[PDB]
Amino acid sequence: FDCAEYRSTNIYGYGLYEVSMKPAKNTGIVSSFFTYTGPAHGTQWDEIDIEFLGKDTTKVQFNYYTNGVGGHEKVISLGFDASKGFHTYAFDWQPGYIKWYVDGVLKHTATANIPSTPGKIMMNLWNGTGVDDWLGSYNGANPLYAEYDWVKYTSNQTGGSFFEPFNSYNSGTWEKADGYSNGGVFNCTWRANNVNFTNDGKLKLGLTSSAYNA
Ligand SMILES: [Ca+2]
Fold this sequence. Notes:
Elements: E1 2-8, E2 15-22, E3 29-37, E4 46-53, E5 59-65, E6 74-77, E7 87-93, E8 98-102, E9 105-110, E10 120-127, H1 132-135, E11 144-155, E12 162-164, E13 174-176, E14 189-190, E15 195-197, E16 203-207
Parallel strand pairs: 1-14
Antiparallel strand pairs: 1-10, 1-13, 2-7, 2-11, 3-4, 3-10, 4-5, 5-6, 7-8, 8-9, 11-12, 11-16, 15-16
The structure holds calcium ion.
PDB class: hydrolase(glucanase)
Keywords: hydrolase(glucanase)
Assembly: monomeric
């Protein structure tokens, strides 16, 4: 299977992160929005997530890692099927807390071990393996798509905030991952061809089958 990941070329720190998106629905996959940095960037592993388990798009899972330590999962019931339309998700990441919101309403707050290292803004869609209890077993359904209408970041004591509407590939600010696979539980290869932009200005990530899957 071929999957998709769009990520920022620069790094960002404390500030408010907002994304308007519509994840994909299907057992075995994840659609997400998150910050990430790690060792392959000579840092501790720090990440804040917003993930939709395709197995149940009426819920959202929040998590974060500080120095490679995770285990802060929090699943919340949205009260709607995220896969049916665009909603705004966000997290405000400050030195002493992380607050997550859904359509402007505070849904969860974390204060233990909040991360500090700026990371890149990443969005991806993939099928997993080896973690059937968490994601459900992937049944090869394809093609599947996750859509993003816009990303906005408001820096604290940082430099530049930005607004990205996804009208087209802005390669000066983002990159499409290509030709490698994260390995581990990610059971697909990232492909730049699977990162596309629709006509009405949405980022569209696709999950498709490869020759050996048919
Ligand atoms: Ca847009």
